[PDB]
Amino acid sequence: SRPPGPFPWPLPHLSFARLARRYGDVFQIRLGSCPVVVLNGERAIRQALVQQGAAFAGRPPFPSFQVVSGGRSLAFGRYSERWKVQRRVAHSTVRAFSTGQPRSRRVLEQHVLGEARELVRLLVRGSAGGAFLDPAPLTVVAVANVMSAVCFGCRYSHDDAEFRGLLSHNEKFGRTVGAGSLVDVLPWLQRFPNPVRTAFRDFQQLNRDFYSFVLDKFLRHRSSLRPGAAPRDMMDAFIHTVPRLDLEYVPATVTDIFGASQDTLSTALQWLLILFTRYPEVQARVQEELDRVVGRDRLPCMDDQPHLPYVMAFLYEAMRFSSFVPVTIPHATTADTSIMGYHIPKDTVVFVNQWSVNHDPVKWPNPEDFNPARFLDNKDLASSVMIFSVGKRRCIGEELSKMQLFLFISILAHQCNFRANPDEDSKMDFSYGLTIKPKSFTINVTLRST
Numbered sequence: 001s002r003p004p005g006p007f008p009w010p011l012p013h014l015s016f017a018r019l020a021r022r023y024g025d026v027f028q029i030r031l032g033s034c035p036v037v038v039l040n041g042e043r044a045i046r047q048a049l050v051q052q053g054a055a056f057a058g059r060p061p062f063p064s065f066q067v068v069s070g071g072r073s074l075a076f077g078r079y080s081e082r083w084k085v086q087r088r089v090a091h092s093t094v095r096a097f098s099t100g101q102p103r104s105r106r107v108l109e110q111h112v113l114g115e116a117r118e119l120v121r122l123l124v125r126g127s128a129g130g131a132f133l134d135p136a137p138l139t140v141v142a143v144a145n146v147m148s149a150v151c152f153g154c155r156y157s158h159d160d161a162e163f164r165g166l167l168s169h170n171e172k173f174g175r176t177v178g179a180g181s182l183v184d185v186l187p188w189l190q191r192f193p194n195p196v197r198t199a200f201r202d203f204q205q206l207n208r209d210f211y212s213f214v215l216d217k218f219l220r221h222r223s224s225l226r227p228g229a230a231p232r233d234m235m236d237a238f239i240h241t242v243p244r245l246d247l248e249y250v251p252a253t254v255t256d257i258f259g260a261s262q263d264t265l266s267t268a269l270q271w272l273l274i275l276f277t278r279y280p281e282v283q284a285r286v287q288e289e290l291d292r293v294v295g296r297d298r299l300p301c302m303d304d305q306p307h308l309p310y311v312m313a314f315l316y317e318a319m320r321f322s323s324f325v326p327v328t329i330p331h332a333t334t335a336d337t338s339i340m341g342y343h344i345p346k347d348t349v350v351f352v353n354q355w356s357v358n359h360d361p362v363k364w365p366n367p368e369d370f371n372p373a374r375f376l377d378n379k380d381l382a383s384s385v386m387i388f389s390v391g392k393r394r395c396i397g398e399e400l401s402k403m404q405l406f407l408f409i410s411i412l413a414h415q416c417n418f419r420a421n422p423d424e425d426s427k428m429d430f431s432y433g434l435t436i437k438p439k440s441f442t443i444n445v446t447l448r449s450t
């Protein structure tokens with residue numbers, strides 16, 4: 001009555017496809033001490049998260065998830081009548097900046113082009129001569145600075161000590177999440193001294209310390225915001241949006257907002273850049289379009305988003321091709337329910353394999369081939385690209401990140417031409433972990449004319 005019996009796992013998102021190509025689109029595995037249901041087909045995923053949304057809108061009660069954002073994290077909070085309220089106002093407030101309305105063209109846009117302009121500088125200048133440089137560190141800083149200005153209005157300068165403290169936080173966080181995830185499925189590691197416990201204890205103090213940082217900006221904001229003024233950033237907007245929830249939920253969602261923003265947008269920029277170098281034809285087609293729609297005396301902006309159907313097509317498939325978020329945040333069942341004729345008890349840990357969707361040869365004919373033209377005359381097969389999830393837990397920053405990413409590649413593609421390194425293999429290897437990042441690579445960025 002239940003899906004193929006738990007197979008001890010590990011024997012990562014690819015192994016899941018290997019066992020989905022043997023025991024069907026839905027199977028179970030024993031993960032350390034936790035039993036997990038893996039969904040792979042789009043049928044299984046859409047039928048679970050969309051048609052049976054409420055039944056799957058939950059989250060496990062993992063140790064990792066408890067200290068993040070001071071316990072009121074939206075990304076990891078359980079499914080509650082109060083979480084539903086948080087999500088509703090969270091999603092609505094952050095998409096208010098995705099749009100082209102006044103709010104958005106004030107906070108997001110001119111901070112993005114402000115940092116994009118700064119980034120093409122450091123690239124063009126870092127490749128001076130025939131020099132080559134690794135762009136990955138510059139995508140982390142760029143993404144951290146933009147969301148800094150978006151959540152607290154503070155667009156730091158790369159000298160700033162407070163900013164070098166944010167970058168340092170993000171690094172330590174990425175270096176200890178592994179330990180946190182290991183304590184989630186092997187909780188017996190908190191019983192005796194070990195490296196994972198020391199790293200997990202470091203993990204949790206890291207979150208306490210950073211949520212403390214965000215909660216400081218919350219007061220200085222609330223203390224300083226006159227009642228008739230429009231929001232200077234996204235924490236002002238959340239202050240204005242105030243069952244009902246504690247005042248402390250405001251900085252908790254703003255910590256989630258900044259947090260989930262870092263490694264994801266960083267990883268995306270790295271994919272967009274390496275793809276330009278390994279696929280010069282699309283680089284040429286992309287930028288040449290920007291000329292026909294933006295000219296050559298002004299940097300692109302949000303007003304050009306609809307008149308640039310290809311730059312988005314290049315984005316929508318960059319996401320499909322890499323699927324750098326191959327598995328969403330673990331889900332949990334709110335009650336007993338059915339999937340593909342399989343019984344699922346309540347409170348079961350369920351994984352969601354997005355990579356299986358974006359690489360099922362049936363759905364996308366030649367999945368391992370890069371061709372943005374898939375999404376062109378598109379409108380609603382770009383919504384089939386599953387890099388953000390679907391259902392009640394779908395990313396609340398979907399539209400904010402494709403709007404922010406677009407501006408980055410448009411300003412970058414508008415100003416410069418990106419060249420690969422000849423000493424490097426024409427192939428793109430993949431670096432797995434947290435996200436699927438392109439293994440270290442070099443590029444030479446030059447200022448173009450056309």
Ligand code: HEM
Nearest residue numbers: 074075257260261264265325328329389393395396397401
């Ligand atoms: C390319 C950039 C991004 C990608 C690919 C991405 C992807 C995802 C994924 C896969 C999830 C888990 C969904 C699930 O478990 O079903 C998620 C959740 C979430 N994302 Fe993003 N994300 C990105 C950027 C952002 C940004 C910029 C924000 C905020 C401005 C954000 C805010 C959130 C939040 C709050 C959640 C938790 C929502 C919930 O659990 O109800 N993300 N995202």
Ligand SMILES: O=c1cc(-c2ccccc2)oc2c1ccc1ccccc12
Nearest residue numbers: 075170171173174255256259260262263
């Ligand atoms: O401080 C964080 C760092 C990071 C992080 C992740 C990868 C690399 C570097 C930092 O993520 C988060 C953070 C905080 C809250 C989050 C809530 C939901 C999802 C992610 C969050």
Ligand SMILES: O=c1cc(-c2ccccc2)oc2c1ccc1ccccc12
Nearest residue numbers: 012013064181184325327328329330351
């Ligand atoms: O515990 C996790 C395991 C895993 C995981 C990843 C690959 C294979 C098995 C589990 O992923 C996540 C976990 C927790 C939070 C996450 C947030 C965003 C994206 C992924 C997350």
Ligand SMILES: O=c1cc(-c2ccccc2)oc2c1ccc1ccccc12
Nearest residue numbers: 010011012031178181182185432433434
């Ligand atoms: O076997 C693994 C278990 C786990 C794991 C980690 C924490 C809890 C449970 C399983 O993660 C990975 C595994 C294998 C490869 C990975 C590659 C990149 C990122 C994570 C990987």
Ligand SMILES: O=c1cc(-c2ccccc2)oc2c1ccc1ccccc12
Nearest residue numbers: 064065068177178180181263433434435
């Ligand atoms: O971005 C993440 C990726 C991952 C992750 C874990 C395993 C494989 C790939 C990504 O985990 C987390 C993330 C963020 C916050 C977390 C908080 C508690 C526990 C795990 C978290």
